[PDB]
């Protein structure tokens, strides 16, 4: 199990607006067409996967459950 919130540098209690700002920052940092980082592919892979889950209310709800047990 991955810590999606750590990957995105947000708190488990943050709202969608805050997580989206974080996605924007991290996509700018690590997107393959924008990044100058040596580990861009690896880091963007983890960020895009986390955002895929956290951006969706239902997906985020089940992830939260799954992380407690």
């Amino acid at each position: 199990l991955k810590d999606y919130y750590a990957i995105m540098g947000v708190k488990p209690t943050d709202d969608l607006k805050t997580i989206k700002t974080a996605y924007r920052r991290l996509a700018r940092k690590y997107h393959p067409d924008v990044s100058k980082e040596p580990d861009a592919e690896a880091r963007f892979k983890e960020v895009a996967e986390a955002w895929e889950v956290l951006s969706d209310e239902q997906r985020r709800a089940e992830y939260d459950q799954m992380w407690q047990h």
């Binding site: 805050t18 700002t21 974080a22 924007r24 920052r25 700018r28 940092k29 924008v34 100058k36």
Partner: protein, 99 residues
């Protein structure tokens, strides 16, 4: 031994004319960084002022919201890098032709 004068988001607002709410988004977008991001009170240095001024100029020029400005500035930094390289390569071609 090296000293960097810092100041509040309120002072950052005063120096830039950008509201504290907007400055908070600009921080969230990673355009500027407070000295201690986790500290209860964010403090910034003069370089944050320089970055916000450049971003304001681009907002006036292109009328993008802050996320679009952040990306545009990054891509423009890349454009300037490629342009410097283009010029250096053109100079090397001239140097060859003149030898």
């Amino acid at each position: 031994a090296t000293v960097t004068v810092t100041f509040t988001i309120t002072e950052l607002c005063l120096r830039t004319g950008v509201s504290e709410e907007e400055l908070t988004e600009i921080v969230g977008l990673g355009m500027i960084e407070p000295h201690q991001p986790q500290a209860d009170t964010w403090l910034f240095d003069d370089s944050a002022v320089t970055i916000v001024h450049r971003a304001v100029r681009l907002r006036n020029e292109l009328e993008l919201d802050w996320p679009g400005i952040a990306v545009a500035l990054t891509l423009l930094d890349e454009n300037a890098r490629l342009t410097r390289e283009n010029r250096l390569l053109q100079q090397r071609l001239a140097r060859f032709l003149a030898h």
